[PDB]
Each structure stands twice: as structure tokens, then as C-alpha cells.
């Protein structure tokens, strides 16, 4: 076990903690940010693809449809699918103890 304070780490699993609902980041040329939506493998190519919904409307993306198979419901031009294995936890909106003194 790693020597720290925060646990819930499963490197042997996916990478750290990338699941539906949680924010993640993809390592590519265009630096963008999106939250996970659907995580699965289409009928043909076995690969954990986590559907990320881009906050910014970029021309070229889809409305949450991979290979003509809608997994979730999102806006138009704000759904980019990527390999979950090549994803990174996004702590852009991660909070830890809003206040110091917890003892009321």
C-alpha cells in the first residue's frame, strides 16, 4: 500500500479512477476537457472507449454517437470518444474539505 492520505487507488485496474460521471482528460494535440459518459467496447473492436463530452462546441465531433450507436444523450458537436486506458483523471472540479475545522 502506498504511503499517503487519500486511497481508492487501483492502478492495475484502469489507471487511477476513470468512470462515468467523473471528469477526465485526453493526451492529444488539441488540449480540451470533457467528462466521461459511456465506457464500453463496440461490437467489433475490443477497447474500453470512454465517451468524453467536450465543454466547448468544436466542429468535427458528434452528438454522442460512436459507430452509429448512441450510448448517451449530449449536445451537438460536444462528444468525443477516446480510449479509457489513455485517459487521465481530471481534478479541475475536485474539492477536498471545503473548510478546515470539521468539528461543529
Swiss-Prot record:
PTM characteristics: Ubiquitinated. Polyubiquitinated in hepatocytes treated with palmitic acid. Ubiquitination is mediated by E3 ligase TRIM47 and leads to proteasomal degradation. Phosphorylated on several serine residues by IKKA and/or IKKB in response to immune stimuli. Phosphorylation requires IKBKG. Phosphorylation abolishes TRAF2 deubiquitination, interferes with the activation of Jun kinases, and strongly reduces CD40-dependent gene activation by NF-kappa-B.
Domain CAP-Gly: residue ranges: 40-83
Positions of the UniProt region annotated as Interaction with IKBKG/NEMO: 18-98
Location of this chain's protein in the cell: Cytoplasm; Cytoplasm, Perinuclear region; Cytoplasm, Cytoskeleton; Cell membrane
Tissues in which the UniProt entry reports expression: Detected in fetal brain, testis, and skeletal muscle, and at a lower level in adult brain, leukocytes, liver, heart, kidney, spleen, ovary and lung. Isoform 2 is found in all tissues except kidney.
Self-association and partners: Interacts (via CAP-Gly domain) with IKBKG/NEMO (via proline-rich C-terminal region). Interacts with TRAF2 and TRIP. Interacts with PLK1, DVL1, DVL3, MAVS, TBK1, IKKE and RIGI. Interacts (via CAP-Gly domain) with microtubules. Interacts with HDAC6 and BCL3. Interacts with MAP3K7. Identified in a complex with TRAF6 and SQSTM1. Interacts with OPTN and SQSTM1. Interacts with CEP350. Interacts with RNF31; the interaction is indirect and is mediated via SPATA2.
Disease cited in the entry: Cylindromatosis, familial: A disorder characterized by multiple skin tumors that develop from skin appendages, such as hair follicles and sweat glands. Affected individuals typically develop large numbers of tumors called cylindromas that arise predominantly in hairy parts of the body with approximately 90% on the head and neck. In severely affected individuals, cylindromas may combine into a confluent mass which may ulcerate or become infected (turban tumor syndrome). Trichoepithelioma, multiple familial, 1: An autosomal dominant dermatosis characterized by the presence of many skin tumors predominantly on the face. Since histologic examination shows dermal aggregates of basaloid cells with connection to or differentiation toward hair follicles, this disorder has been thought to represent a benign hamartoma of the pilosebaceous apparatus. Trichoepitheliomas can degenerate into basal cell carcinoma.
Family: Belongs to the peptidase C19 family.
Summary of the function given for this chain in its UniProt record: Deubiquitinase that specifically cleaves 'Lys-63'- and linear 'Met-1'-linked polyubiquitin chains and is involved in NF-kappa-B activation and TNF-alpha-induced necroptosis. Negatively regulates NF-kappa-B activation by deubiquitinating upstream signaling factors. Contributes to the regulation of cell survival, proliferation and differentiation via its effects on NF-kappa-B activation. Negative regulator of Wnt signaling. Inhibits HDAC6 and thereby promotes acetylation of alpha-tubulin and stabilization of microtubules.
Protein name: Ubiquitin carboxyl-terminal hydrolase CYLD
